[PDB]
Amino acid sequence: WNSNVHSYRF
């Protein structure tokens, strides 16, 4: 399991 964080600013 990998890549759990999304920080998404728009």
Side-chain angles (χ1 to χ4, degrees):
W1 189 85
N2 292 94
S3 313
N4 72 300
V5 180
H6 171 87
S7 184
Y8 184 29
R9 178 171 287 275
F10 61 87

